[PDB]
Amino acid sequence: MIIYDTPAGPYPARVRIALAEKNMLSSVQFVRINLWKGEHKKPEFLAKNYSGTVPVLELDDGTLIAECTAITEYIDALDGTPTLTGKTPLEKGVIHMMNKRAELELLDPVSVYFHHATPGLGPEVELYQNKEWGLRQRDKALHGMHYFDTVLRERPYVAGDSFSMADITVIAGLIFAAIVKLQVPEECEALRAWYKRMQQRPSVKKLL
Amino acid sequence: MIIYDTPAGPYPARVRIALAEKNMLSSVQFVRINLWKGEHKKPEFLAKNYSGTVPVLELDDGTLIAECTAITEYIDALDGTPTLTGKTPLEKGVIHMMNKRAELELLDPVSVYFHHATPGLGPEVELYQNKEWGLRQRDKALHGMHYFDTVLRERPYVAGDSFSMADITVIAGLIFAAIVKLQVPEECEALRAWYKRMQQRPSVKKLL
Ligand SMILES: N[C@@H](CCC(=O)N[C@@H](CS)C(=O)NCC(=O)O)C(=O)O
Ligand SMILES: N[C@@H](CCC(=O)N[C@@H](CS)C(=O)NCC(=O)O)C(=O)O
């Protein structure tokens, strides 16, 4: 398997964490895409991924699987025992809900804030920027932190009693938040504690 | 099971189609949320869904499953034989990729265009609007149509040889597109043909 990514990207982190979690890092050849050079916006990479983002998985037969959620679903089901994406119908549903909600309310908006209301990847890569939109996404992400704090006052992991794809998305959300110095509010005690715990997981600790 | 939705909403259509597809419509009590009155933005509905959108599934024990993808994953796995979200690892991966890509490149941007660069749900509901962002999402959606046309010149359904959650997302994308009169380009022959076929499916035909 090939993963096209940048090693320190927060979305890439979602797949790298999931790979470690599945003891599969050794099954993967990582190929560097230089986002700083806008390599992801040029025809060669766009042929690997219409949406122009990393990571993207390429299988031995050339099948391309793009999107963190889809890659995770692929690698989680491979060894026949899913430990990230759910076994029962309720688990699959709640994990996908929380995974998507973490994208919507935390990770995606931090990333839109990076690209739109900061220099981001630089003026040659960020050809269009909407600062007003980017700033509102910053605020959305802050609300997201408060939302995930309320979740974590009631359960030990984002989707319930077990570690899942959803924790990985929030972790990636907080990694991005650190990149842009969007501070987790002091009063977000449950989110802070959970994150410290997450940073103790081998998969996460090695990466950071 | 309860679904909170509005009957003619394109995102709601994704779940209603999936329910029909799984022969499960009779297992569902539909409860009306009035988006035109901004009911989805008030405290009572926000307690059902932090993200403030429809549809949302509520189980007999009060468990809430939000997000079209998550609801579909839940109901597809219920009867033990998934026909929408994939059996093999490759199927799960490709279907999730295409499902997410249809959201990203077609349905979501049409919807953002509706809410931001048209009157949308009206000036009392659409309290903030970014017309410039909304118009760029319109353009993104147009590109999406061209993208899905290229996919459908090579395979009969969005994710491959079989009907899946991914077709449902594109269908919902085109339903929304019709609402806002964003015309499918003439040269998008494969997308047009596929859509006519989709409108022949009982699940889709009844809904429209
Ligand atoms: N797989 C992601 C998208 C990934 C993503 O936005 N990755 C970042 C890298 S951290 C990226 O490609 N940014 C490049 C850009 O926006 O120009 C998804 O789940 O939608
Ligand atoms: N489940 C959807 C979101 C659903 C959605 O945007 N639904 C529309 C109804 S067609 C909505 O609630 N719009 C209300 C609004 O934006 O104010 C998702 O998959 O993210």
UniProtKB/Swiss-Prot annotation, chains A, B:
Keyword Transferase applies: yes
Domain of life of the native organism: Eukaryota
The protein's name in its UniProt record: Glutathione S-transferase 2
SUPFAM superfamilies in UniProt: GST C-terminal domain-like, Thioredoxin-like
Swiss-Prot/TrEMBL GO biological process terms: glutathione metabolic process
Keyword Ligase among UniProt keywords: no
GO cellular component, one term: mitochondrion
Entry-linked Pfam families: GST_C (PF00043), GST_N_2 (PF13409)
Domain GST C-terminal, first and last residues per copy: 88-208
Phenotypic consequence of residue 115 to A: Loss of enzyme activity
Catalytic activity: RX + glutathione = an S-substituted glutathione + a halide anion + H(+)
Family that this chain belongs to: Belongs to the GST superfamily.
One GO molecular-function entry: glutathione binding
Domain GST N-terminal intervals: 1-83
EC number from the UniProt entry: 2.5.1.18
Alphabetical keyword list: Transferase
Subunit: Homodimer.
Result of altering residue 9 to A: Reduced enzyme activity
UniProt-annotated binding residues for glutathione: 11, 40, 54, 67-68, 115
